[model samples]
Target: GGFDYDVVVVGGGFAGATAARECGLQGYRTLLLEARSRLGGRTFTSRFAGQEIEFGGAWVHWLQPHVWAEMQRYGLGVVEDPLTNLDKTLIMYNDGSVESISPDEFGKNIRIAFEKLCHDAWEVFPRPHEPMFTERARELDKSSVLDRIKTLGLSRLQQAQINSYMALYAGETTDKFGLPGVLKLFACGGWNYDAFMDTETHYRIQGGTIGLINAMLTDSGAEVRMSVPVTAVEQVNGGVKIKTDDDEIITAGVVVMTVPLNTYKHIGFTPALSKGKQRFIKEGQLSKGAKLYVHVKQNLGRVFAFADEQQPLNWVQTHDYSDELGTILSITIARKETIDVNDRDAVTREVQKMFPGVEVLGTAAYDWTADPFSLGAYAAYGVGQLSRLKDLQAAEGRILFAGAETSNGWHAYIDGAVESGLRAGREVKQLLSLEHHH
Candidate 1:
């Protein structure tokens, strides 16, 4: 025997919350389930150094309709990016020598490469500002980031800079991420770094990311049980039943899988997930970002990108702002499947290698990779797998697949997460409507 629910959402992240909320609003008895100890799946506030900070899901752009609208509905505000809010400076590391690159040249190189890559890729198969189909963008999705850049014919220096940045973004070497995914991140955020991207993303997080999640769950009439990890979801008699570790069972009319594709393996389904879905999760790349904020034993009030040819470091941005984090280095890394970052000394050594004299007083990081639920920061697209998004997006029986990964619009981003959430929520709403034997 088990508790029956009109709809059971298997995740508590943005997707699950939004789905449950939409269903509840439609007058369904919705239940939102969370496996974590707390509500926010990956976007919650963590207290550190006597301050309230975010360990995950901190950014949300205004361009994201569902997220921004929820902010206004909940009356949220935002703060500035204390770190990246500065003029740009380039320091090149070539053959153990650091050379200053002019802002004009560096900016030009980056802009040209970005535009050309995005335009050329889309030229073959144009996806609308939004994505609704797959297999159409197949060619661009099949190539690696390195291969794509080479096709763009970028200059040697510019190429090196982009390569390192790609490494940082993907948490792995350029070989791990696809060109389609990176460009989608830029395009969804409006092709700007801080001003257009960060500012818009956080215009509503002033109330904290949790606020939005809370509101979403509350309005949806969801019954969220924390620390309850579901072991399986199976279709039975034209419905779904979820089994959790606590001996509790959730017999749901529909199962919305709002968890990450990789994490979805945790919940076994009777009919089994599509082959493409499984492959995507197994092969899909992750963004392993590392951020460090040290109390200003040394204060630097600008941003720097050190593109060194000999080191694994692609770019380093330095910011010392009390409003944000002081003397902080947002060092994002990829290709870290075997790297040991827990040894603070080793991390310190790498920082010293990237910047000789900037003594890092301390460090802070958002480790989604090691996290029990997320296992990575976000889902990114890899070479040769972009065609499966559509088949993956479609709901199989009472189990519906969604999250940042299903969102081809801005795959592997907060906005993408919301996009998938809204689409899935609405789709579930329609499906229930059609299924209701009124």
Candidate 2:
């Protein structure tokens, strides 16, 4: 007798927005609650130096069917990064040596090593969309990305080359991530590194990711409440009671948690989640990576560079011209190498290590780790943790889960968020329908 709505979606990122939109379309009274003041949780588009800056999930491609469909539906366009067309890739080795090679060469060597590492991706993840690939998941789940990289028997340079890709993908050291997670991503991209990059980083949303999010919200027509941090969720009266930070109480027939994996530990679930869910929340997903955008005075041109794991910057590339300011370079600093945008001198010194005599004009960085709500960036898992995919996606009675971390096809991506959202919406619809019929 106290249900406030048919469905309640907690968190307003891609997953929440998508689920709420679908719920509305299905004619369910849905409410999307967001902890932050704005939507586009991990995919935030802000301004820096009079230019639009993507602080979170920024890339997308037609290969991603779920998100691509939305893009086509909304008439959204995309622009490719110049790095995709760059011929030469500069590699910085652990031994303090810099080497340059054609993108074709870089692609070929990494492909050989990556193919060997995840050659059996289709076998291990027979169905990239469904993570529970029978008992085989347990077998491959035991392997680590570093373990796979070593087994390839590549040379030091080749290893460094591959490690560069590995560090970038996992957003940290290779050993910290599981082989299965990377393989699932590879399989989704047609089991090839080149194909993976083409879709993973080549194209970006034209009006930024917010453009598509805006479209989704416009079509959704669901009640969206911002700055509404949910403190607790309890099942009562055949529905869910949601407690917000402001001591506000709301109720709904079903609740879909679209928050980040690390944030689950922050919210209090009435009877508590399962052991597996708690374990995953405690362990969390590996996303301690940092992305930096800087304006360099030098004309780096269309350049793609990668350094070893220990290096300050794992990868960097020139995106476009920032008018009179300088050439805009997108740099991904690996692991704990955090950058302070205010410390201009420190930034110059680091950029010079990779490219000597390059003048740094301005720098901007978004530390997802520093954000309490996010806790981490993308969900790159640790060793032997691939099976958590199924565990995390499991629903708890009237509660459901949806996020990038819960997806298998495009895990840790915007597409994954959308995919999980649609799935959760459909699940909720079916569950509520059954309840009504029963």
Candidate 3:
């Protein structure tokens, strides 16, 4: 019996690309299929206002082992976002009042609140990578971020700041976010406030995320097909058959699915996925948010701001500063339903709330929720959803799962995606080696 390729990787994101690269290096005839015309999955690096802007999964840190190692492998460098050197910190109250506070004071307040929120981090997640290492995490997963925050007894200002920050992290309201998800991140950041904040906001790839991805692909020697939507997967006699949108069927010894969790429902699987996997796919994740790059004609001077969950833009920070563009503000909207980010007037109105009397230049955003390929932003598990990690990561026959959402550590970040891809690559290699011996 023969196959068209030794391995077929579905999705062209970091996960698929990494897996394909690994298999290619192992001398496997690997093929990668992507639904979109471009790769990088949810992370897109595009030019806007004479500056390169990342539309998704922007930040990275040395603490994230997998992605960090990849950066060093390709000689990629990092650049700071000036978050630590912020000149101003603004907090928008529920009553539509914006208060300006010193960066130090705001940091102190956030540190205090986060300390209270993640006080039991050491206990709940002693081994951050092993999310379910502690039984306490199981109980903690049963609760939501709102549930934990309610008991914190935080002051109104502290509550607002924490709420806005968590909402941005979860890409949804606190009520929908699972507590362990945030705790795991805090634990991974060495259980410190400054370390935790820097992991998510400080560093980004120098050129763009695409540079690392291209480097990996170039090393992989895998045939990559873009704009090729995989529609179905069927377990044939001894191999898996992949059906593309064009009705072309390709056979491979093994298949790796690297698409987003929300996208699983769209692909038809023969013999169907397990009951647990089906349920996970149906429930999906809780990160249906928007990432906006607002180029305004105002030099907010390295400003960082957070607003109540009621606002469309829950978190805002300066991405780049220039005399011509003034400032390119990166905004995160926890709930995309609240406002259309594409509406310059609507976004301008919201920006004015944070910085009054500022001229609105333009706005750029991609609606991940509306995109059929993504269906949502990066994964942020809801209450009780963390326990399903094992089932979601389980392999069925020749079909293997690999994606950021299935990662045990740094889940929802670029690092998690790379880690998962590497895991899947090892599994594929092991499976094939055993077959060859047989």
Candidate 4:
């Protein structure tokens, strides 16, 4: 009878914000508790080199329905990255050889190899949104990205490019990345390599992802509490009690957990989660990478580069160029343990391998893997983990789960996070209605 809110959302990422907004719109007394001082979670929009840059979760497309709908609702605009028009293309080989290749030839090779890798995408994911619609996906889930690549008989350059590309998507080494996950994304992108690649690099939010997030939060009308890390959750007779880091307790009819799967191990739960949920949490998602934005003195016009998985910097692309900032290169590292992204000297040495004489003026990055709240980059399932997605997304009593990792479509992207949040919000509404009727 003393419940403080009808709904409580933990973690103020896209997922939590959407859930809170949905419940609040339905006239529920909602509370959003975020561990960080600011909202937007992993999708942070901050200033770097006198320009707005996204430190995490930057790309979006209309193909992702949930986020796209939200974008339309908020009247958010998109700006394209200059990827289609490249002035230089560079490839680093496994044997430590750097070669500048024709942009046309490089794209053709990558398209052919990537198409070969995802040839069975239709069969594997007949209904991309319904990930388990076909048994083929489950069968393929048993294999790794490397397992599939090895069977494709790709050439040396093809193998290097595809390996690095898959690593960028998986945000980890291809050998340990799950094949079905990539196939699922391919299937979602109309089963075409060009469409799939476009989904990753085509466009970004014009005002940044935070704009959409702020719009959702404003519409939700939920009480927003920042820097409030939830430490424990206990199920009571009719509601759930949440214990914050400061030891204050709050009660709610239902709680939506939007934290990343890897961070669940740190939060205490009464009666514990299910064995399947526990196992999934222990296994976690594969993405443990770092994204670095390097501001260079050289005006490298529309450059795209890829290095073999053995290298610390797997993928690099020109994000922006101007006389003031010169050039901003976005670098993706699949494994964070290999090198410190913040180390200027180490990052400079690595960038020089791809761009021989480019002078790095400044570097910006966020160590998501080391961040206590995230513990990793975006979600990428590993071998034998995709089959348990349904279980991970299932609710336990009054506790609901929502995050990009739990989403069936676009699992690691911002769209997936919004989809999962909307699903959880619907579930919460049904749950509350059922209780009221009883």
Give residue 364's lDDT in candidate 3 (0 to 100): 93
A best-first ranking of the candidates according to their lDDT comes to 3, 4, 2, 1
lDDT of each: 0.65, 0.81, 0.89, 0.89
Q: Tens-digit lDDT track for model 4 on 90-179? A: 888766689999999999999989999999998888899998788888888889999999999998889999999988778788888988
What pairs collide in candidate 3? none
Q: lDDT by residue for model 1 over 1-438, one digit each (tens)?
A: 233887888788887877778788888778877888887776777665456666556766676666777778778776665533355565555454565567667766766655665664334434434442345455567778877777778786677667666666566667767666666555555555533335422333876778888888878777888888888888896688788987667787788888876676566778877776677656655665444433334455665675533453455665344544445655544433433455667667766665566666676665567776877666766665555567678788778877877876656556667777787777777667756421
* Per-model TM values vs. the true structure: 0.85, 0.93, 0.97, 0.97
After superposition, the stretches of candidate 4 with alpha carbons farther than 4 Å from their true spots are 434-438
RMSD of each: 3.7, 2.2, 1.6, 1.5
Model 2 C-alpha lDDT versus the unseen true structure: 0.81
The residue ranges of model 2 lying beyond 4 angstroms of the native Cα positions read 84-88, 95-97, 102-104, 322-325, 337-342, 434-438
lDDT of 2 by residue, 1-438 (tens): 458899999998898888988998888888999998988998898876567878788999888989999888889889876554674588888665678877888767766776777788777776787766667767778887888787778976578877877887777778887877888888888766667768756789888888888788879888888899999999888989999998989999999999999888779998899888888889998777767888877666677887888776777777666445567777876664544534678778877777776777778887777777887787788877777667888898899999988876887789999999999988888778845421
CA lDDT, candidate 1, residue 187 = 53
State the lDDT at 221 in candidate 1.
Answer: 75
